[PDB]
Amino acid sequence: IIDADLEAELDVDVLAKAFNMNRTDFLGNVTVIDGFASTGLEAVLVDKDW
Amino acid sequence: TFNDVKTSLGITESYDIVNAIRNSQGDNFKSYVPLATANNVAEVGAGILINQTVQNDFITSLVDRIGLVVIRQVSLNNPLKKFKKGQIPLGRTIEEIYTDITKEKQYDAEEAEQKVFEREMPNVKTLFHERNRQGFYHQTIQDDSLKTAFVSWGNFESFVSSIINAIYNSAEVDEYEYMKLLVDNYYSKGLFTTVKIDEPTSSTGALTEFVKKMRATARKLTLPQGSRDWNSMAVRTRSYMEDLHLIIDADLEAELDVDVLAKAFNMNRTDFLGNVTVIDGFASTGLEAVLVDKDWFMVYDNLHKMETVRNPRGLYWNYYYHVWQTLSVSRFANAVAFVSGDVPAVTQVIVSPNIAAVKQGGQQQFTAYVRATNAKDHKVVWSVEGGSTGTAITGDGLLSVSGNEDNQLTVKATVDIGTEDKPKLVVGEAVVSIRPNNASGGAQA
Amino acid sequence: TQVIVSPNIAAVKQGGQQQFTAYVRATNAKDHKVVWSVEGGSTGTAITGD
Amino acid sequence: MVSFTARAKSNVMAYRLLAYSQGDDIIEISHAAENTIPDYVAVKDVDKGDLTQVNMYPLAAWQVIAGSDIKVGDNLTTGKDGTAVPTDDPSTVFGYAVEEAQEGQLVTLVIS
């Protein structure tokens, strides 16, 4: 779970991620959100059964 | 039975999100202001332990029953079980036999007049393995008591099976750990072919070099022509890229994936560094990673079954899932350790025909394979011990039996590294029994 | 961040024992020695250092 | 074990070090005095007039309330309220710690 802005920063600057732009073998099922309200919370990675 | 139960029992709350929303004034939490029941969603969301019986909202006399029971089916697997072999019911020892290639003679019909029946011995070496771990998984299921917590046999039975599944999880996870142990053990014995690397978890250059070294290694390991340098035996063998596996700590793995683009490009490719098995960190220090041919593992199942017994007094069942297994490692098949930081100049000298026998007065040529971490040729010194007689060995590794003793000679290949004040005598050892011959002699001339 | 105490729920008969385990979700700084304590009505009733 | 009847004479608290005295045809028990060697350890709260029992057995170790912070291997003696505290005077040592304890926590001890 990650917002679009950070996601974009990562897509462009980190080539490993760019190479694996849509691969769930790299990270999880990247789902883009509006943004977390909690201050400092940049991203969360959870099990689908969470 | 409980009474004074908090909704936030073990909650180390950072801040009260409810109040954050309540006091929202153009801040991020304004996005939750439009919500209608946010206060309750937060209050009893995010979990909830214990269980405080809740009365019905409309009729307070009535209580709300549980609508759904969720019995989890989570199963753990041994990431290394793909290296397992078959079952061994009867017997305990496994003999691994591996032959070898043997030189090349030149066609010569003239010579062949007398060399029919020349006699040329095979180069066969064996290893033995045996049942090792023998444990079991003990659980009590007091079914009759459990029944008060269920309203249906579907759920009841599901629960019981989750316990049984947990037993299987327990077994499979421990299996993993013991296989991990095999790796650290083999390493602790200096049997992996070692590779000196700089701490990869530092400079990206080190990470880059680390990858290059692994790639170099892998290509050598699968080099069809065969090699005698990638295992703990002197035998010539080979691997397949799909049979090579990389045993590596997730942290380092991530470092490599991100910083090395070649790794990223081939992150999804088994033809790059073989198959990859990401693990938790090794117990050994410098052991950063292991590249290994699947046949290296000699893990066989022995006895494994579940025994049960009913306690007629306590109305319960005990389950005893036994797991006896032969866990071991072959010295054949290729395997490489990537060791960060300090390494020995020589890790493990190997001597040819480790197990040999020779007639009184006969001779046997040996070869030493110095597993150095450099290309400096640290020089082998041949030696023989147990020589109750003048039996001796030549400087080229040629053992020559006196013609009369038999004392299971110890053949040594000594490599002294470092200063002679701290003579680090790395020694390869072999043993030679002496077959009776009683040939006429005493002194030549 | 948080400390998780093993069996959230126990049921000691009196004079019996129950081993609890703390899972300190530190983050980076390897914090250590957990102080165990227990609250109740009848005096005595206590937890060992482990 | 060998059990016998004894009467508390001063609000016995669990996990406290106990002493005893000869009372009205019965052994009376209470918290051990400060800086001495205790005889028995409480494992139940027993009030000033309450009657209870003692279970005799050469226990290897006792679990008592630490009267102060205790380091592994510390020689222990009685402290305030019958708690166990670190010391260095042999004549008051009744055992020693085999585990760390903070004040108010239980500390396992081995008798000597």
Report the candidate in D50, A44, A5 with the shortest Cα–Cα distance to residue C42: D50
Please tell me which chains touch C, using 3 or more CB pairs under 8 Å as the contact test: B, D
Spatial neighbors of B295 by CB under 8 A, at least 6 apart, are B243, B330, B332, B333
Positions of E strands within chain D: 2-8, 17-22, 27-31, 40-41, 51-56, 61-65, 75-78, 84-86, 95-97, 106-111
Q: What are the chain C neighbours of D14 within 8 Å (beta carbons)?
A: 42-46
Positions of E strands within B341-436: 350-351, 355-359, 363-365, 368-369, 381-385, 392-394, 398-400, 409-417, 424-435
How far apart are the C-alpha atoms of B215 and B205, rounded to whole Å? 15
Which resolution, in Å, applies to this structure?
3.6
Spatial neighbors of C10 by CB under 8 A, at least 6 apart, are C18, C20
Strand pairing report for D40-41 and D17-22: antiparallel
How far apart are the C-alpha atoms of B336 and B232, rounded to whole Å? 10
How far apart are the C-alpha atoms of B327 and B169, rounded to whole Å? 18
Phi-psi region of B304 (alpha: psi -120 to 50; beta: other; left: phi over 0): beta
B325, burial (CB in 10 Å: exposed 0-12, middle 13-18, buried 19+):
buried
Method used to solve the structure:
cryo-EM
B238 within 8 A of B221, measured Cβ to Cβ: yes
- Tokens 């033809």 belong to residue: B271
Report the candidate in B42, B59, B57 with the shortest Cα–Cα distance to residue B7: B42
CB-defined contacts B:C, below 8 A: 14
How far apart are the C-alpha atoms of C27 and C3, rounded to whole Å? 11
Spatial neighbors of B39 by CB under 8 A, at least 6 apart, are B18
Give me the residues paired with residue D5 across strands.
Answer: D53
Helix/strand/coil for D20: strand
Phi/psi at D25 (5° precision): 65, 25
Phi-psi region of B326 (alpha: psi -120 to 50; beta: other; left: phi over 0): beta
Give me the residues paired with residue B292 across strands.
Answer: B245, B335
Q: What are the chain C neighbours of D105 within 8 Å (beta carbons)?
A: 35-37, 46-49
Pair of tokens at residue B77:
């697997």
Give me the residues paired with residue B324 across strands.
Answer: B134
Phi-psi region of B314 (alpha: psi -120 to 50; beta: other; left: phi over 0): alpha
Interface test with C, best of B1, B6, B7, B12 (most C CBs within 10 A): B12
Phi/psi at B18 (5° precision): -70, -40
Partner residue facing B29 (CB), from A25, A34, A37: A37
Partner residue facing A16 (CB), from B17, B29, B257: B257
Spatial neighbors of B337 by CB under 8 A, at least 6 apart, are B187, B192, B193, B194, B195, B287, B289, B290
Q: What are the chain C neighbours of B11 within 8 Å (beta carbons)?
A: 2
Are D107 and C49 a contacting pair at CB < 8 A? yes
- Chain A touches chain C, with at least 3 Cβ pairs below 8 Å, answer no
How far apart are the C-alpha atoms of B178 and B81, rounded to whole Å? 11
Phi-psi region of D25 (alpha: psi -120 to 50; beta: other; left: phi over 0): left
Phi-psi region of C19 (alpha: psi -120 to 50; beta: other; left: phi over 0): beta
Pair of tokens at residue B440:
């006429």
Report the candidate in B396, B382, B360 with the shortest Cα–Cα distance to residue B428: B382
- Tokens 């009467």 belong to residue: D7
Report the candidate in D85, D68, D89 with the shortest Cα–Cα distance to residue D33: D85
CA dihedral defined by D44, D48, D49, D50, rounded to 10 degrees?
0
Q: What are the chain D neighbours of C49 within 8 Å (beta carbons)?
A: 70, 99-102, 105-108
DSSP percent split of chain B into helix, strand, coil, nearest 5: 25, 30, 50
Identify residue B244 by its one-letter amino acid code.
L
Helix/strand/coil for B31: helix
Partner residue facing C37 (CB), from D16, D43, D105: D105
CA C6 to chain centroid:
7
DSSP string, A1-50: -EEHHHHHHHHHH-HHHHHTTT-TTTSS---EES--SSTT--B----TT-
- Chain D touches chain C, with at least 3 Cβ pairs below 8 Å, answer yes
Positions of E strands within B177-255: 193-197, 244-249
Partner residue facing D100 (CB), from C42, C44, C49: C49
- Cβ–Cβ contacts within 10 Å for residue B160, how many? 16
Identify residue B376 by its one-letter amino acid code.
K
